[PDB]
């Protein structure tokens, strides 16, 4: 989860 720390997050709000 590289890229996905800043927004996989994001979208799991």
């Known amino acids: ?3 996905f ?3 996989w ?3 799991r709000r």
């Open 5 to 7: 720390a800043w927004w």
């Open 9 to 11: 997050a994001f979208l």
């Open 1 to 3: 989860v590289r890229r």
